[PDB]
Design a protein around this ligand. Sequence first.
Ligand code: 6B9
Length: 129
Amino acid sequence: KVFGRCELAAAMKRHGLDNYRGYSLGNWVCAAKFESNFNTQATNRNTDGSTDYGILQINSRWWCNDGRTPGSRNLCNIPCSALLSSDITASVNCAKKIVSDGNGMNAWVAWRNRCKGTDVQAWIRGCRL
Ligand SMILES: */C(S)=N\c1ccc(-c2c3ccc(=O)cc-3oc3cc(O)ccc23)c(C(=O)O)c1
């Protein structure tokens, strides 16, 4: 599913990311924009041989199992395919574990490089929430 911006903002709010770990909703929306362009089905093979899955590009070496990443820990206890669903629940639940891991949203390089410190509230502006 490719979400529009305000549609994803409302889904992420409904799923409890607004202010999760202190990160306002616009941070999550901005991160999803730059990780996946709001496409739940996005997959990308990483240089380390792992693959990133879903709207927040969650990684098969640490977080989900894809059966093809040597060393996998599957700390979210889910198949990586679950992160591609039109239902964002599994992505949200695993993202909540990731952002709790110690470095906050810096676990997403794209958030650090493109969202952190910017006017992230712009990503929610205008939306009925
Ligand atoms: C896309 S645009 N927006 C969108 C579409 C569908 C859902 C969503 C649900 C929304 C509210 C609920 O109470 C329950 C939902 O269950 C869903 C189940 C599946 O399989 C897929 C989508 C569901 C959302 C959303 O989760 O907020 C958003």
